[PDB]
Each structure stands twice: as structure tokens, then as C-alpha cells.
């Protein structure tokens, strides 16, 4: 397993950025996930080598940090706040709307591999509850019609 040049170049930027190589581990793992739609288990050994770290160190880090997903590939992660106060302000309605539009529940991926619903703790936008993200983009849920239009922007 080898990283494509375009990805390897970015990883190398991260690794050269901090005073010590190993400090770049989370930036690198974010970069890997954004490229492949998940963290391929095969990617960890060559990442470890670039960071000058043992494989088990990198494995332990991937396991600890919730944002990283070793199991399911998805183009777009729909992170849905399942905390408080989002629960008062209509998380349930957001989840129902997502089920109506995409046919999936929290934890599931669409058959085409396009969308995965990821339940998350507070996203720090509680005044704009109920909150969700689509990869890096973050939104307030207003209604199914509004949500449907938002999701149509991700192709």
C-alpha cells in the first residue's frame, strides 16, 4: 500500500509543519479520511513510517479519536447532534427527515456509499438547534423541504 502522490504531498506538508513530526498525526488522519472517505487499515503502517512512530501508537490514536472511521466508506458524513439542547429543538424531526430523504438511520450508509449519518455530541452551535454538518459544512435544520435542498448541493 502506497499513498497517491497528491495525498502524500499534503501529508508531507502536515509533517513538516509542526516542530516535531509526530505532532502532525491528527492532521494526517483527517487528510487521509477526507481523501478515501474513511481510514483504510492499510494506510496506518506507511503513515506511522512518515511520522517515525510505531504502528501500535498510530492504531491506538485512531481508536481513541471518534471522528475517524476504520469501517465505513462514505463520500459525505452527515454529523447529527444528539445532545442537549438539540433534543428539545427537534433532533427527532431532523432524523425523521433524513430517513424520508435518504432511507437511512444513524450509523447507516446509503447503498451508493454517498451519505453516512453519524450521531455526535454537541457541535457548539446550540442556539441554531437542531444542528447538523455535511462534511465540513454546518447548518441549522428548518424542515424537510429545506434539508432536501441542502442535500442536493452534495453530488
Amino acid at each position: 500500500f502506497e499513498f497517491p502522490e497528491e495525498l502524500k504531498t499534503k501529508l508531507q506538508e502536515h509533517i513538516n509543519y509542526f516542530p516535531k513530526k509526530r505532532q502532525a498525526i491528527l492532521l494526517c488522519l483527517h487528510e487521509i479520511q477526507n481523501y478515501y472517505g474513511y481510514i483504510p487499515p492499510e494506510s496506518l503502517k506507511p503513515l506511522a513510517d512518515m511520522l517515525e512512530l510505531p504502528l501500535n501508537h498510530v492504531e491506538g490514536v485512531v481508536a481513541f479519536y471518534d471522528m475517524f472511521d476504520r469501517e465505513d466508506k462514505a463520500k459525505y458524513r452527515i454529523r447529527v447532534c444528539v445532545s442537549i439542547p438539540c433534543h428539545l429543538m427537534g433532533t427527532n424531526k431532523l432524523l425523521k427527515a433524513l430517513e424520508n430523504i435518504l432511507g437511512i438511520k444513524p450509523g447507516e450508509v446509503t447503498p451508493d456509499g454517498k451519505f453516512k449519518i453519524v450521531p455526535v455530541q454537541c457541535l457548539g452551535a446550540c442556539s441554531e438547534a437542531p444542528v447538523f454538518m455535511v462534511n465540513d459544512d454546518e447548518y441549522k435544520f428548518e424542515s424537510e423541504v429545506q434539508l432536501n435542498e441542502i442535500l442536493s448541493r452534495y453530488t
Binding site: 491528527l26 442537549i84 454537541c122 446550540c126
Partner: protein, 417 residues
């Protein structure tokens, strides 16, 4: 071009931290300079580090990240130990209800950067870090760009403005763990490790990043520093009541008409926050409770308390989550239990098992499936998360829930029957 972010409402009676950040847009360096930005830095670099520490001490500034440690005193402790030293901005803000820090980061990044540079100079740190939670991607990109702006204007790098002071600011990203806001866990994460808190003592100010003296400060804390230098510590102390001076941000959410971030003096009462500033309650329903993030539960009998650091004050980080008369307190308690279940790092046995069991058992209670032994077990676990804990999470994971048991017995009773 940045990722989409919700336009959180922001209002200020003081026009300090939200002077620019009351507008939901990035204020870049040229606009910041037009407001007198970076002039406090220039002033600071003509002062001795010791004088800056003295001003920040006399300002009475205290940490805005939840523990309320006096900032100047913290800095004094760090400079008692030989360098090199490190400065860290904590932008991990991940507690339920808390969204005050992000609006500084996303809208007025140069206010934060200016504070970081001054603070770093004060403690003699030539390397500073911002650790921003992974779920704030826009904030990360905005900060990276703002830092490059500052570097191009000569406010970062070597020999800043001819002062002989060198600084670089690095931006690190978290990856989904609330515990990485705990200052020693944050340092572990910066070192490229799992975010596990360290046994204290030692404290970071003695042994922190790479075992060197390290000051960790919250975003909001740091954003006060340019004001202290610009205005002088006396003028800063005239803001708000004598005993609790300075601006404070209050993120207000739940069942209010105008949820958002309010910049207010600390003599404001909880009642005023809700009714005078945040427009009262949705449907004008009665307030049942206020959750101070995931820390404390205040009843409707406790709304006349000051939003200050006093023994009888609101305290915490000033996070105000409003529940009204129709909201189920047990359901809300379950949400808090779920948070602590998800976020314990699991190093300490009573925290690991206690956070898990508290949520597990409360879910059974909520669903009407709990046995009598489950109820007894729940009470016991709730009182026994803290033993042997080496960070604040274990100490508080049962606190709010215990307050709901004491303040809303009737509601819990319905579930027991």
C-alpha cells in the same frame, strides 16, 4: 472561501469582545487595523514582560474555561521556572450549550491572535499553539489564514517589530474527544498521543508540553488581554461590578426567543439574561430549570442569582440552557448522562464504569424497564464516579444529575412508580 457555518446571533452591551464579532462574518486584518488592531501589541512590546504580567494580574482577569484560575497568577507561576516555555490557546470548546469561543475565532480571529502574541511575550514563549476541536473546520481555516495575514504584516516571526521577540503560532486540530479540552489531555494530544489526562501535580505551568513550563488559556480569556493592554488595567476594572469586573460572554440556548451569545457585565442576573436580553421564553412558558452546560442545574427558584464567580453566583462558563415547564427533566438528565458516557477517557476505573452505568441505568429508568435494584444501583453509581479520578470529568459527571434528583424529586418519582 470557508465551510458553511450557522449565523449565531450575538449581542453586546459592552462593545468589547463582540465589537466586531457581533457581525457574523470574518473580519480580516485590514478591517482589524482600521479599528486600532495590533496597537495593544505594539504597546506591549514597549513594556517589560513582568509589567504585562502585573497588568493582567491587577485586571483581576480569571480563566474563562470553567476553573476560574486568576490569569496573571498563572503566568507568574510559569515564569518562576526556567525556559523555554510554551503558550497554548484552548479552542476545544465541546461542552453542551457552549458556543461562545467559536464566534471570536470565526469572526474576529485577530483579536485572539493579538492576545496570543501579547500573552506569549509576557511569559517568554517563542512557540504558541491553538488547539481547535475537529468539528470547527471553518475556525481552523480562518485561523490559519489570519495567522498568515499577521505574519505578512510583521506581527509574527523573528524580531517582531524590532523588539527582539520571536514567535510562531501553530494550529492543531482535535478529532472528536471532549476530554482533549482538559489541559493535560490537550498537551498529550499536541504531543501526538491519545488525549489522556495526566496525574497532577505536576501542573502544566511547571511541567507541560515536552515537560517544559506551559500556560494553557481559554480563547475568551486570551481575547481579554488586548483590552487590558489597550485600556490599562484600571479602566478595564471599571467594566461591570467592582468585585467581578470585565466583559463576559454568555451562550444562551434552549427555549428562549433570542438564543445566541450575549456580552454582558457579571452583575447581570440569570433572570435578566433570559428575560431582558434573550427575549424571554418560547410561548412565554414558565422556566423550569437552567442547565449550566453539563455542570449544574438551577431551578426556577434560583433565577435571581448573579452571573459571576461568587459562591452564590452562576459560575461555570456562563452557559445558559433554558428548559420550560413542559420539558422532561429525566429526559434531559439522560442527555447529560449520555454525554459523560461518551466522553470519559476510561483511564480511571470508577469514572470508566460509573459514566457507563449512570447512562445505562438511566436509560432503563427512562424507558420504564428499571428494576428496584437498578434504581438503587443508579443512586450508588451517581455518587461514586469521582473516586480515584485524576481529572475534573470524573469529579463532575454525576453533579448535574444529582442536582435534578434533589431539586425535582416529583418528576423522578413519576418514573419510579
Amino acid at each position: 472561501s470557508y465551510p458553511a457555518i450557522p449565523r449565531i446571533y450575538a449581542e453586546t452591551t459592552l462593545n468589547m469582545l463582540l465589537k466586531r464579532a457581533k457581525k457574523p462574518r470574518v473580519h480580516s486584518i485590514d478591517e482589524y487595523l482600521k479599528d486600532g488592531g495590533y496597537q495593544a501589541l505594539e504597546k506591549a512590546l514597549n513594556m517589560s514582560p513582568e509589567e504585562i504580567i502585573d497588568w493582567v494580574d491587577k485586571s483581576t482577569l480569571r480563566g474563562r474555561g470553567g476553573a476560574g484560575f486568576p490569569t496573571g497568577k498563572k503566568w507568574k507561576f510559569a515564569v518562576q521556572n526556567p525556559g523555554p516555555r510554551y503558550f497554548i490557546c484552548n479552542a476545544d470548546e465541546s461542552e453542551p450549550g457552549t458556543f461562545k469561543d467559536r464566534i471570536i475565532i470565526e469572526r474576529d480571529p485577530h483579536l485572539l491572535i493579538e492576545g496570543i502574541i501579547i500573552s506569549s511575550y509576557a511569559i517568554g514563549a517563542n512557540e504558541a499553539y491553538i488547539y481547535i476541536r475537529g468539528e470547527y473546520p471553518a475556525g481552523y481555516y480562518i485561523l490559519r489564514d489570519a495567522i498568515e495575514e499577521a505574519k505578512k504584516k510583521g506581527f509574527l516571526g523573528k524580531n517582531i517589530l524590532g523588539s527582539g521577540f520571536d514567535l510562531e503560532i501553530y494550529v492543531a486540530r482535535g478529532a472528536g474527544a471532549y476530554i482533549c479540552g482538559e489541559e493535560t489531555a490537550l498537551i498529550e494530544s499536541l504531543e501526538g498521543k491519545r488525549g489522556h489526562p495526566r496525574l497532577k501535580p505536576p501542573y502544566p505551568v511547571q511541567k507541560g508540553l515536552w515537560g517544559k513550563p506551559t500556560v494553557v488559556n481559554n480563547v475568551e480569556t486570551i481575547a481579554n488581554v488586548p483590552f487590558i493592554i489597550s485600556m490599562g488595567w484600571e479602566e478595564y476594572r471599571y467594566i461591570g461590578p467592582s468585585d467581578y469586573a470585565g466583559p463576559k460572554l454568555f451562550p444562551v440556548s434552549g427555549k428562549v426567543k433570542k438564543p445566541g451569545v450575549y456580552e454582558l457585565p457579571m452583575n447581570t442576573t440569570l433572570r435578566e439574561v433570559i428575560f431582558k436580553y434573550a427575549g424571554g421564553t418560547l410561548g412565554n412558558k414558565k422556566v423550569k430549570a437552567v442547565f449550566s452546560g453539563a455542570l449544574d442545574c438551577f431551578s426556577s427558584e434560583e433565577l435571581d442569582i448573579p452571573m459571576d464567580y461568587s459562591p452564590l453566583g452562576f459560575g461555570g462558563t456562563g452557559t445558559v440552557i433554558v428548559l420550560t415547564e413542559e420539558d422532561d427533566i429525566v429526559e434531559a438528565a439522560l442527555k447529560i448522562a449520555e454525554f459523560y458516557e461518551h466522553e470519559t477517557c476510561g483511564q480511571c476505573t470508577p469514572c470508566r464504569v460509573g459514566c457507563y452505568e449512570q447512562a445505562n441505568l438511566l436509560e432503563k429508568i427512562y424507558k420504564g424497564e428499571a428494576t428496584e435494584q437498578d434504581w438503587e444501583g443508579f443512586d450508588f453509581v451517581n455518587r461514586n464516579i469521582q473516586p480515584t479520578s485524576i481529572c475534573g470529568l470524573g469529579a463532575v459527571a454525576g453533579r448535574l444529575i444529582r442536582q435534578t434528583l434533589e431539586k425535582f424529586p416529583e418528576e423522578w418519582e413519576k418514573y419510579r412508580k
